[PDB]
Amino acid sequence: SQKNGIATLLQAEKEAHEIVSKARKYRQDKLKQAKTDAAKEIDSYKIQKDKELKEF
Amino acid sequence: DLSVRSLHDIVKPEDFVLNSEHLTTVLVAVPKSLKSDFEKSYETLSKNVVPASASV
Amino acid sequence: LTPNQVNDELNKMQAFIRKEAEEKAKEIQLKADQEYEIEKTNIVRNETNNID
């Protein structure tokens, strides 16, 4: 019967949904990493500007 | 049994148990005449309606 | 049962089923990541403007 039909679909679609959830989690992690890198770059720019003011 | 309003008449499995998001994998019909006509209707629905699968 | 071929459902329930979510997963992992990078760049630009 459907022991290898809808039953195998219940694993194929399960893996597809797991991949969707993993992609969402990876997107969130990439968002966090990009925010951290942007904050580090902004801090570096602020430090460079402060160093320029101190040099002046 | 035909046009039965008692859902208990149908077993819990093979009744959209753990239904997938993109595939309900369940349908109920009560065709007239012999079961061969039902199979032909299932054969008619076996293409362009749902990927091939079996149900009781 | 019903009139149909034998063992012909080895890929009809997979290729047109799992891809319907795999394509969405790939599109999310691409577009959301790109939008997050753009938003991080904009936030960095605003913070750099304040620092400036």
DSSP secondary structure of chain C: --S--SSTTSSTTTHHHHHHHHHHHHHHHHHHHHHHHHHHHHHHHHHHHHH-
The resolution, in angstroms to one decimal, equals: 3.5
Contact C40, A37 (CB under 8 A): yes
What are A55's two structure tokens? Answer: 């040099």
Query: Closest chain B residue to A4 measured between Cα atoms?
Result: B53
User: And the tokens for C52?
Assistant: 């400036």
- How were these coordinates obtained? cryo-EM
Q: Which of B11, B18, B25 best tests the A interface by mutation, with the highest count of A CBs <10 A?
A: B25
